[PDB]
Amino acid sequence: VKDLKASQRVCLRSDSYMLHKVLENKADPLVSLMMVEKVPDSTYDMVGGLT
Amino acid sequence: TGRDDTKETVYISSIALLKMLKHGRAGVPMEVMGLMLGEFVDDYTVNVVDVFAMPQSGTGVSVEAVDDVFQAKMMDMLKQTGRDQMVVGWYHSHPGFGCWLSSVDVNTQKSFEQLNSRAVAVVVDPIQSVKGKVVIDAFRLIDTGALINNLEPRQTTSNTGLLNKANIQALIHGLNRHYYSLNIDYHKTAKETKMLMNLHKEQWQSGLKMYDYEEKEESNLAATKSMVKIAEQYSKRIEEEKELTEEELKTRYVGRQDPKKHLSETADETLENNIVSVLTAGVNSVAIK
Amino acid sequence: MSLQHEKVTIAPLVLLSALDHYERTQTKENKRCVGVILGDANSSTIRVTNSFALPFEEDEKNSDVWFLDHNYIENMNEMCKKINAKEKLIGWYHSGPKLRASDLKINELFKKYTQNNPLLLIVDVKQQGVGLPTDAYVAIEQVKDDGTSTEKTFLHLPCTIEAEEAEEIGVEHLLRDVRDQAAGGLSIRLTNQLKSLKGLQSKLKDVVEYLDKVINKELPINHTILGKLQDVFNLLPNLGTPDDDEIDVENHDRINISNNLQKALTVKTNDELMVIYISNLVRSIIAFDDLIENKIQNKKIQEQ
Amino acid sequence: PLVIGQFLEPIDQNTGIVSSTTGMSYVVRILSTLDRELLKPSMSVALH
Incomplete structure (x- = not known):
């Protein structure tokens, strides 16, 4: 319970809802928003002219 | 004491399994019942040779929902054919939940226990069954004396002493409360094995028929073309391979569901079919004329 | 009655039940257990769902003598309507081992109880044929091949055997x-x-x-047998025709592709070799490094 | 039979998070030799 903290997602098992594993992944539309847009491959050199 | 309070390992035939299952599933959702006819010997063996179903009820299985006039009528037939055997327990299907027992079914259980000292209850849940064997267990009453004076686990001794769970959650709950479960076994004589299996008359026709050739030009054409797309990616995987970690190899060049494993698999499986096809074709032409 | 009957599928519950009944009536040495076959019929596919023994005797001295119980059938039919709604009398089984001509006579009486044409379903209790033991028949009437004598005789219906998905799972895994x-x-x-x-x-x-x-x-003479077997000769292939020449172009095509598939698998096993050859150099270096590294460790202990 | 969900996000790469039309939300195990590259975009999925 020390390896747990309040407002930490946690996975459960069967219909007992016994704790299984800890979820350190948190699925949100905030995230999907960034996921379409990816990490961009515009570089500084292309904006070269003004440094 | 006067007893050994031990549960049998239950031998269910070929003849009984299919009857139990067919009636449970056609009849589900709706709890249904019927008796089990068998032979008792030893104290560790109980045979479920045959079974017969007893009519539907929507009030579930009760002692006040069974048809005894029907049971009597069947036993009258059973005597005229000369197949009479003693009742060895009873079977029922729950309609949608795992093997466990409700209170109402303990009341039904209790009176078979009185009639025949040792008797079993085989419970078939045919819609959590998918191997014809899973979510089917036998159960048997535990006495109230057995819990308080520790004469419950005399059935863990003088048997295999193993219990194989199909539902971990469901069995364990009634394992102390109101039943002890012991594992189920299957049997047949060799006459039965051969019958159950069958030998097909179309097994010999499909051997000696070479399929249409339109579907074969397509087969070779499609397969050889598809292996070009993944042949190329097999090079890119192994550009480096001297890098550590197996997951790592698959993350750099996108070797997820590996192109080595897939491409090989495709090579073995079209190869198996083409050898068999040239075999069948050459057999038919040389054989027939 | 019925004019829809092409095939009879049989579940392996039915085949086993018949088998059991033979051996639980104590009827053996080419004597007959005969029972009623239960399930849906009046369909192209006849499906037999269940079966039960009937009281039955035979005397092989005179086969115009046998015992069939008239009480028993009615009582069993009433019970059987309750368990499944599928079940109704759609024939009678014979326990074989062959089709006796004594089987017509029984079939004649059996027509009265039935709501269709009764079926004569032979289930052999000792295993036979490269094909199935189980062969199905229906009573029909026809003119012979001598153009004389209309005789009620038995029309073979082919069989392949089938079971619902309910029964089938238990079959597949019980089998071993x-x-x-x-x-x-x-x-x-x-x-x-x-x-x-x-x-x-x-x-x-x-x-x-x-x-x-x-x-x-x-x-x-039978022009049914001789007539069908006339067709066989015209259907017969022969050699030296342009058709066989087209087979040989296809045989080159299929073996050539099997050659390229084989070559491919040579490069696959040529890969596994490499991985091992790399594995061998890494394992041999680190294995030896450890020993050297241990000598120094031991050396600290010895010194003081 | 299958029952149709909508695939949300991978939480691992062998275990995922889905939603159903059943009215619930689950954690499910992803079976092997199937594409893990087409679970990145949220798309309809089928659960047993």
């Missing part, structure tokens, strides 16, 4: 063999080609023999 109803790898498919050809060989022999015994013994 290779199975002739499923198959594994290439190795099992070589087996299948030998077995399938062996069935042809045996079956051809029966046809020749039948032709012999017609012209020797002088059993009566």
Whole structure:
């Protein structure tokens, strides 16, 4: 319970809802928003002219 | 004491399994019942040779929902054919939940226990069954004396002493409360094995028929073309391979569901079919004329 | 009655029940357990769902003597309507081992109880044929081939056997063999080609023999057999035709592709070799490094 | 039979998070030799 903290997602098992594993992944539309847009491959050199 | 309070390992035939299952599933959702006819010997063996179903009820299985006039009528037939055997327990299907027992079914259980000292209850849940064997267990009453004076686990001794769970959650709950479960076994004589299996008359026709050739030009054409797309990616995987970690190899060049494993698999499986096809074709032409 | 009946599928519950009944009435030595067959009919596919024994005797001295219980059928039909709604009398089984001409006479009486034409379903209790033991028949009437005598005789209906998905799971896993109803790898498919050809060989022999015994013994002529077997000769392939030449172009195409598939698998196993050859150099260096590194450790202990 | 969900996000790469039309939300195990590259975009999925 020390390896747990309040407002930490946690996975459960069967219909007992016994704790299984800890979820350190948190699925949100905030995230999907960034996921379409990816990490961009515009570089500084292309904006070269003004440094 | 006067007893050994031990549960049998239950031998269910070929003849009984299919009857139990067919009636449970056609009849589900709706709890249904019927008796089990068998032979008792030893104290560790109980045979479920045959079974017969007893009519539907929507009030579930009760002692006040069974048809005894029907049971009597069947036993009258059973005597005229000369197949009479003693009742060895009873079977029922729950309609949608795992093997466990409700209170109402303990009341039904209790009176078979009185009639025949040792008797079993085989419970078939045919819609959590998918191997014809899973979510089917036998159960048997535990006495109230057995819990308080520790004469419950005399059935863990003088048997295999193993219990194989199909539902971990469901069995364990009634394992102390109101039943002890012991594992189920299957049997047949060799006459039965051969019958159950069958030998097909179309097994010999499909051997000696070479399929249409339109579907074969397509087969070779499609397969050889598809292996070009993944042949190329097999090079890119192994550009480096001297890098550590197996997951790592698959993350750099996108070797997820590996192109080595897939491409090989495709090579073995079209190869198996083409050898068999040239075999069948050459057999038919040389054989027939 | 019924004019829809092409095939009878049989579940393996029915085949086993009949088998049990023979051995639980104590009727053996070519005596007869006869029972009623239960399930849906009045369909192209007849499906037999269940079966139960009927009281039955026979005396092989005179086969115009047998015992069939008239009380028992009614009582069983009433009970059987309750368990499933599928179940109604759609014939009677015979326990074989052959089709006796004594089986017509029984079938004649049996028509009255039934709501269709009764079926004569032979289930053999000792296993036979490269094909199934189980062969189905329906009573029909027709003119002979001598153009004289309209005789009620028995029309073979072919069989393949089927079971619902309810029953089938329990069949597949109870079985603890290779199975002739499923198959594994290439190795099992070589087996299948030998077995399938062996069935042809045996079956051809029966046809020749039948032709012999017609012209020797002088059993009566059948234009049903002789007529069907007339077709076989025109269907027959021959050699030296343009058609066989088209087979050979296809045989080159299929073996060539099997050559390229084989070459591919040479590069695959040539890969595994490499991985091991890399694995061998890394393992041999680190294995030895450890020993050297341990000598120094031991050396600290010795010194003081 | 299958029952149709909508695939949300991978939480691992062998275990995922889905939603159903059943009215619930689950954690499910992803079976092997199937594409893990087409679970990145949220798309309809089928659960047993």
